[PDB]
Write a protein that binds this ligand. Structure first.
Ligand SMILES: Nc1ncnc2c1ncn2[C@@H]1O[C@H](COP(=O)(O)OP(=O)(O)OP(O)(O)=S)[C@@H](O)[C@H]1O
Ligand SMILES: Nc1ncnc2c1ncn2[C@@H]1O[C@H](COP(=O)(O)OP(=O)(O)OP(O)(O)=S)[C@@H](O)[C@H]1O
Ligand SMILES: [Mg+2]
Ligand SMILES: [Mg+2]
Lengths: 219, 251, 251, 219
């Protein structure tokens, strides 16, 4: 998963500008920036939901990429469990019951997994959506604010679970997220995106780093 | 590789699986059965006070009409489900998958068409078992399958392309219905009016929308060599366009 | 109080405002104009080699058909816009507002109907200015307004109630189209077949769906006392039901 | 805005159970609880999006209630500014240009306010949605995770702005939210909801309070 000279604009609005990216033997890379900078855009380019990025996206298509972008995507009139089975069979290799269970109980979604998604709360949908992405047993996982709607405990358990999994599976994880405190729990580096390019590569608060870099936009 | 093919088929299986679980499917089947039984019972066996002898061909055509419409709506739902739930975003991540998505849906459309044709067959067999008349040729039922496959695949792929072009679902259901019920409406309303009336009417034989819709209420069919080719050619190009388009459209 | 009335009207203004800004509206108008001009020019003035004299009544009916369909779709969009964008959740917070929402939409439906009738009038006036024939009575155009108001309000409120009942939009557009194009299709297809054929056909005069749809292609109309009352009564009850329902349905 | 004996269930699932609520001359009330407890449900009952709550919701209907529940609600093919004008005219009293501007520039959404909503990021949509609610110049404001998708600075400026406004307008604000740190910025009390009822009334970290109360569900 490498990005070389990626440039992307919407009409006159340049979002990405000659932006490069890689995983320097790191596993967990956080992505930090202000709203309107383009974090989702970068992720979409990597996922491959964009084909007009004027640059090179280096992906060995042999590999699977799991992801969650913006609001969760689920089939509303079906159960949570149904969605997990479907995606495992459809986007993934097949449905691995043991794997699935570890995620369900680790996240603690068990009590409502058999209920229809339309009856789920926003938080519940996100816990499920993360699991849906994980069900592909991917190597590259790309998450757009994965804990955006999670409660304090949900966030910790989900993030912890993913970190365990990156060793079980040879994964590389990109997490774009506010709540720098969550990135600080699970990370080994973070990159700060501003004005279409990376400004800092921080190897390892992130909050102080963030403000130092971005506060002057508005202030 | 077979792994690719397997994933494509798994998506197909889920769409068909859904059809066989929703109570709506079952309701629609019962409605068709009721309507056919109703025609048979109310007048086919009584209008002219016959000795309970009926024309299966009248029943056959009516059943076809109803099933093709229901079928087309099933096809549209199959097509629009991922736009509706937004789940399409989880599929179109790379070319191999994007193409596989089109392939999967194409297969689902074909299988839906087969299902509807099987329903049609069964409803009519029950009618034949029930009353008197000369049974219809097996081969007639078979040709009816061919009609279903072509009709639904043509419209399905056409609408699919539109669905992908606009990323809207409301207008796909609308077009499905609109197109079906407009041809038989407009023909006798104004075709005869212009000095080009005959020209226009003849022209319809070379326009799949017109001739495929018109044959929905026929007791039989026989496509002319051109008409046959045009329809099939149209199916092939739509399939191709769907692939070329999905490969380039941002999601 | 007038403050309440004001807020209701402000919502109406926005829905109409939208109609007058979208390029789609303008396109639809041009399409109708083109089709009417086309009929006038191609054959009305030439089929029998007349000395350029036409029947405005033929044009009139065709224009009505087209505008009622476009109009109904405008009505459906007006109805479903808030379900589609999900913005309905921002309105239905209390009874006074919930009721006002229904009132606003009812007013918008009426104004849409007026707009379409005005378009109809203008298109035909242009045709009358353009060629020869005895001009149609002003009062005929006026009655045509009444038809538009009733037709569209009946269907609008009916579909509105369904929209609120199911909270789906795809099926509202589908029903709008379906109902319009099914009546004229089905009548001559099977009405004459059953021993109750005459009974059924007569029955349609008392069923608004059937008689309102059938009159969409008439050059004139005259509702029977029953038919007139039934249609209007149907409008009133739908309006009432919409209120009773919105007041209780969780959003 | 008072709630007396509110009880609400979905089939066998009781969400609220004889729950009472008021504003004891307070202005900013935070609402804290785990995902699945019912915070949105409470807010919907207050907003009046639910009419099957078996209890008394005491609202002087003379007053306006502004709110934001779950994902933002906007007209996608229209500009941000359009939406503000519409709602001010439609749900509010009328469009107050000066008021509107103060909010737009305070939030800092100005650079994209004239762009179509469908072109907005999730963060941008939330900043706008908050403003949309505020445009009613309401007395009661009910916000469901108002800063859920906001960046660190966005959250601070938006929350600060609202606090200023509660004095300009005689408001009462209910905020249901994760990010206890945001509640701690703007609050004068918080209530902890668990098992359908309030458990603590905390008058004024909230994070420590939260865990003490809820950690045992899963742990
Ligand atoms: N479909 C679109 N049309 C036009 N502009 C867009 C579109 N999608 C995104 N943008 C713009 O692209 C820029 C970056 O968008 P995103 O990638 O969504 O931002 P982000 O870094 O993910 O920020 P968030 O959503 O607040 S985490 C913003 O200025 C958006 O207005
Ligand atoms: N439409 C619905 N049908 C059935 N159950 C529902 C529905 N909406 C909510 N629930 C259930 O009601 C409970 C509380 O729901 P909410 O009010 O959405 O939760 P919450 O306190 O807002 O939590 P969040 O979303 O994570 S802040 C959960 O157990 C949901 O599963
Ligand atoms: Mg984003
Ligand atoms: Mg919630």
């Amino acid at each position: 998963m490498k990005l070389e000279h990626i440039t992307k604009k919407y009409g006159s609005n340049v979002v990405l500008n000659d932006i490069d990216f890689d995983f320097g033997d790191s596993r967990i890379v956080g992505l930090i920036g202000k709203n309107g900078v383009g974090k989702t855009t970068v992720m979409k380019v990597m996922n491959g939901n964009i084909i007009k990025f004027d640059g090179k996206v280096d992906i060995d298509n042999a590999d699977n990429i799991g992801f969650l972008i913006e609001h969760p995507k689920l089939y509303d009139n079906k159960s949570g469990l149904y969605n997990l089975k479907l995606f495992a069979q459809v986007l993934g290799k097949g449905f691995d019951k043991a794997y699935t269970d570890k995620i369900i109980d680790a996240f603690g979604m068990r009590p409502y997994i058999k209920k229809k998604v339309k009856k789920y709360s926003m938080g519940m949908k996100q816990k499920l959506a993360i699991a849906v992405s994980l069900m592909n047993k991917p190597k590259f996982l790309i998450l757009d604010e994965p804990t955006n709607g999670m409660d304090p405990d949900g966030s910790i358990d989900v993030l912890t679970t993913i970190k365990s999994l990156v060793n079980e599976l040879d994964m590389r994880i990109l997490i774009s997220s506010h709540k720098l405190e969550d990135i600080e729990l699970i990370c080994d580096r973070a990159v700060f995106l501003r004005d279409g390019h990376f400004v800092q590569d921080v190897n390892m608060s992130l909050r102080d780093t963030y403000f130092n870099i971005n506060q002057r936009g508005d202030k | 590789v077979p792994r690719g093919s397997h994933r494509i088929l798994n998506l197909v299986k889920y769409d068909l699986y859904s059809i066989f679980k929703s109570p709506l499917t079952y309701l629609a089947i019962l409605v068709v059965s009721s309507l056919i039984a109703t025609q048979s019972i109310l007048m086919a066996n009584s209008m002219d006070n016959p000795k309970h002898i009926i024309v299966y061909g009248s029943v056959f055509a009516a059943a076809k009409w109803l099933l093709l419409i229901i079928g087309l709506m099933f096809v549209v739902k199959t097509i629009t489900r991922d736009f509706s739930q937004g789940t399409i975003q989880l599929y179109m991540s790379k070319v191999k998958t994007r193409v596989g998505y089109i392939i999967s849906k194409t297969i689902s459309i074909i299988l839906i068409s087969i299902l509807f044709a099987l329903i049609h067959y069964v409803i009519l067999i029950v009618v034949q078992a029930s009353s008197n008349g000369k049974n219809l040729a097996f081969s007639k039922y078979v040709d009816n399958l061919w009609f279903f496959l072509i009709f639904l695949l043509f419209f399905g792929l056409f609408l699919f392309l539109i669905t992908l072009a606009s990323q809207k679902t409301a207008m796909i259901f609308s077009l499905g219905v609109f197109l079906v019920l407009i041809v038989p409406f407009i023909k006798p309303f104004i075709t005869f009016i212009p000095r080009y009336g005959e020209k226009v009417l003849d022209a319809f034989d070379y326009i799949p929308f017109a001739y495929l819709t018109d044959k929905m209420i026929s007791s039989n069919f026989d496509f002319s060599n051109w008409q046959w080719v045009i329809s099939l050619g149209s199916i092939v190009i739509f399939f191709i366009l769907n692939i070329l388009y999905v490969a380039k459209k941002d999601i």
